[PDB]
Amino acid sequence: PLSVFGDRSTGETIRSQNVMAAASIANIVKSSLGPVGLDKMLVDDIGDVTITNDGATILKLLEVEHPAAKVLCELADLQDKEVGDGTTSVVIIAAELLKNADELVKQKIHPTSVISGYRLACKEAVRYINENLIVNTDELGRDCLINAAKTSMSSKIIGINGDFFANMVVDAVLAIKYTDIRGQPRYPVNSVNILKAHGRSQMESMLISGYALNCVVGSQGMPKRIVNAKIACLDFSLQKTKMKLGVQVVITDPEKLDQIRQRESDITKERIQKILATGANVILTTGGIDDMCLKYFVEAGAMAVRRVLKRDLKRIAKASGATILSTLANLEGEETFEAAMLGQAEEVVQERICDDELILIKNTKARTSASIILRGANDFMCDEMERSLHDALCVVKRVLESKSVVPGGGAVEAALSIYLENYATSMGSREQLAIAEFARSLLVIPNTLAVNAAQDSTDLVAKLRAFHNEAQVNPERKNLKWIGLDLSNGKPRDNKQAGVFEPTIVKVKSLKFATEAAITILRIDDLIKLHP
Amino acid sequence: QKSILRDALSDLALHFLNKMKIMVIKDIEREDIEFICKTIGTKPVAHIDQFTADMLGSAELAEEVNLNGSGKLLKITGCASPGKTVTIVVRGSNKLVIEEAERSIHDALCVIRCLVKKRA
Amino acid sequence: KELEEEAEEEQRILQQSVVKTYEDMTLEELEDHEDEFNEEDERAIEMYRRRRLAEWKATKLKNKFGEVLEISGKDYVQEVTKAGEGLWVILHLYKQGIPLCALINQHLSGLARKFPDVKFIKAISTTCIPNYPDRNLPTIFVYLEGDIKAQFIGPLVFGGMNLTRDELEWKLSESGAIMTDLEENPKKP
Amino acid sequence: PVLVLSQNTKRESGRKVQSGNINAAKTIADIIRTCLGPKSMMKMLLDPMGGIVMTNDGNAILREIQVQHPAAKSMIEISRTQDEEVGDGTTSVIILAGEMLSVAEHFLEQQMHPTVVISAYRKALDDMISTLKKISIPVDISDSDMMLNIINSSITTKAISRWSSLACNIALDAVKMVQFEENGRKEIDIKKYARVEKIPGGIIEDSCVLRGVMINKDVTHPRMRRYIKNPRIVLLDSSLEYKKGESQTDIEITREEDFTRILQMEEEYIQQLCEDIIQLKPDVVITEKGISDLAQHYLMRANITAIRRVRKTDNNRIARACGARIVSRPEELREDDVGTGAGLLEIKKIGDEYFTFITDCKDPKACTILLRGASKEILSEVERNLQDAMQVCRNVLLDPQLVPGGGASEMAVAHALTEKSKAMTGVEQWPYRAVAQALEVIPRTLIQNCGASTIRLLTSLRAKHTQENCETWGVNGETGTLVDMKELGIWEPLAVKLQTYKTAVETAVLLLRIDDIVSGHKKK
């Protein structure tokens, strides 16, 4: 037969194998979904343990050796990059509707028909979400962001603490207002520095109205607090000026030797006076600082920080109005330092933490900045808190940029499922079957929700379907369409009035990514695995 | 241009260029210089004395575009001397669908090529 | 950096490999510590110092080359065979082909500077070997005394453009050249 | 063959793993349950490196224990957290966490979801912090008697308790000697400037904190004076011999009068550096690097004592004590950088070593504890207890609040929030009372450790601890009786107790939110 020197799996076998792999990944990630599902606890080969709940971290830490599951892992990572929320939901959707599509294929329906049905159903679902399922976050101000942060943090380790967290979260985002094209506000998240500390309880997490770099004063004798900080950000090491790789000195008469040695320090020394000739009070540099330069700084009464990270220094320079300098060289041929390139900070203090010390730059003059310090029981709790905080910041950013949200708690999924079941009667073709299946697939998210809470999921999803049917078939009952299941009493309640909202970006991107992942994994007809 | 054996950009040089409010781009492969010249209309410069405005390409806009947090691109749009050259950028969820889309687009281009070759 | 106390320094020295065991230093740190060494064995440490000084002066006596010297086919026989007893050469056969000759030429100068102990010689292929094929653009044919000791002919053998500064040291030394101050086989990546 | 995940990946899920997690914590809570109280029992730990740690505190026990169960790893991290943050209450927080998990397991079995238990735990934590702040009493910082009493309360449960009347004083002195005012604001209290050094052999009560600094160095040259009455100390960071530099120089000599001229140039450079040091008239010079023979000769000709290489931390504490300042370039050695105030410098001999003391200095801001004992392990335990006392003293100087000890505060807050819970209704009240009786373990642990019967004693304590402002009533663990802590006189900083409660509840939350484990795979 074939001379390939490899393993060939053709027909229903490979389709079933791919569906099994996708279902395996989905079932792995599915136990940690919703405001009731718990979190997982991954231990490595060496032994280091991470306590995680978000799907992206779980799927990146896990190692997978099946392509039909590597695609799901890549889908989760892509959802994390593009949006930041709904990493588990998109994987669940993709795998479950892939299983439904394989079931459809098993009745000898051609996979091209089911792919076309999925594509048309996704387009129609996105259109319906955009038209009849969004609410503008314009009349609701300062509270839609809080509700979005709360519902994004509900499933995390800081769930019921959200009232304390969500508030400060939006404050952080409100400290990173930016203007780019003179009329479009921008929120460059990841500019808020998140710091770890394992001291006091969760209520003691600090929201600093100014950057908090994680470094220490260069020398102990230098003052650790500055009343009025004139920051001079630098991007070059203050070490003795070794000449060059090419330039090398050669001495013929010793009388000229010792003098050049003095210069080997004096150049550096000279630079320092220039920097201190303008009253610079705090010095931040990415390069190292030798002992002599530290002595100059301590004798001048100004604190200096060495080996500051490039991103931290960039953010400090942007926030304080300082200009980062790679070298001292003006448009003329002479070294100089100008007072116009010193940032102003109202305070700079080396504050003690649980066991170490970190530097707070408070009330930078140019533009308001913010940083967050997370206090927890130990390292694992703090890192999980940091991941949850990143998810919350991403959600708030998405809400602010795109002023539109949709009801949460499976409201959008139930509405789309009932609409798509009511859909597929437009064309009247065989492909409509695929659309119908897609509808049923969009019932996976509410179901598993009630599965995690040990509630009667069939009755709950039936009640949601009935309420959305009443909303769709009766125009005056449209207010019923904003309803989703609730865990405190296992009851379908209006989440629009309850305060559970998710940015529409999450739902739209998850739907599109899931349907295209299912399409690209469904086209497979046979697998040919070559021998290593 | 990407120049091994000699740092094409130094800290002092980049500092001066940024001071004069200019945009600097480095690490350009030697194989792409013909494509760049045919696209935007510049001419290669290997000596400072030969660097003049008579051999300096022009464009309506130069942008650094972010693809929603999934990389960064440089786009030169509105070249005053549009050459016989266009570029295609593809988007996709995973690598596999992107590769397959590239192959399909190449097949369509080859079909149009055959139709151009002999008209039948 | 060094904001660490006696207990922390002991923890670090124990964790690094085992301990410096006061026997494996050069003229720099055994000279600078100078006080941790207990005084009941002054004769032993002084004998070790005198033997290490003898070793250093012997090494500096045979370190006399410093930089690569380039030769033609005339004297090639003498610097390939009569280079000296106990000395081996490099014999980089190079052309004006940009990539590999350029990278190796820039790296061999640094290697010769940091190894003044081994002879570095480079020759052009046209006038060193009669009608060399010139497709195998790199050619470092290491001679131990006058015989074969190693050979690198293909750019694939080096790995192409992806050549760093100091992995060439390991590539030459694997054949039995002077020892390396660096670990790992393919210099990490 | 065909696999989805890795071959070595193992997965566990369901109530099973939950039970395991709880059990893990209990096991960690079972090792050091007998170390709590004034009647504690020492434990011996064998290091993998051959050492021995003979200790009582929980953190020093757990840091030498390696566990492959990740829940126990979390518990060890919690112990280290409590040790680093406050320095006290390790055993209390670990026991509290263990019993909170042990009592949450019961609700986990009765088909109750962990989320409601977590919510009730957080509510209980907030309420216990509130009612623990309620019963606090202020402490007079200026009063040294109460400071000594607080340190005694913190030290009565360790091995050095027999020398408490000494040890407390030591700690107090050090903590009241490091207290410093930085530039304007930012009062500080750092233990980098409070060194404890062990000298084996001698008498335990011979230990004392020196009004200055002690280091283990010797005078560079025999002729230099080993007894300086009123030193003028100058501190040097750089070296005092001739160094090549950074660039490659390669001086070329063609004349007959350049080699000897080069050597004489080196000698004259050393002479110039030493004359620059000398001209400002110092008396003791401390350097972090080497000293050339010419350097010490020139310094000696000016009657200056030179101390060779000193570790940077020792130099920093010397500078903080004498009021001097470290200078790297001697030609810039200013008058203000010279250290005056050192009352005496003495190069003494202890055992078979030379030790340099800069003691008797005026108003120092750095201290060194001459801790003399009988053995290395004995001294290690003594200095651990001194560190605990120092941390407690710092906590009470940074927090003027106090709270009754001996399980009195724990029972008080337990009863307070029990009476609070008796009014509310719902399903979360049961975990609330579970936490209420969970804070009850430490009094029971004390009664068990002292050798008395916990049932009747604790029943009487709980019954009497209900009426007429008896929130200060606790157990005396020396006699195993019920006393009023005011007469017994044992109080603990509020910071330690609140941190203990917070850390225990947070550890309970962390190990109770978890229901799946995936073990075995590559790092990333």
Ligand SMILES: Nc1ncnc2c1ncn2[C@@H]1O[C@H](COP(=O)(O)OP(=O)(O)O)[C@@H](O)[C@H]1O
């Ligand atoms: N308080 C709440 N009540 C009901 N449903 C909620 C609540 N908070 C979140 N949800 C729902 O839980 C679902 C899962 O979200 P989650 O798993 O936390 O995000 P991710 O998928 O990024 O981990 C969301 O679709 C959301 O609608």
Ligand SMILES: Nc1ncnc2c1ncn2[C@@H]1O[C@H](COP(=O)(O)OP(=O)(O)O)[C@@H](O)[C@H]1O
């Ligand atoms: N004489 C005493 N009688 C009864 N209880 C005491 C006495 N001394 C201390 N205690 C109690 O014992 C506890 C001290 O135990 P300790 O070993 O310090 O715990 P940890 O190791 O966690 O710091 C304190 O909470 C205090 O209330």
Ligand SMILES: [Mg+2]
């Ligand atoms: Mg989420």
Ligand SMILES: [Mg+2]
């Ligand atoms: Mg204690």
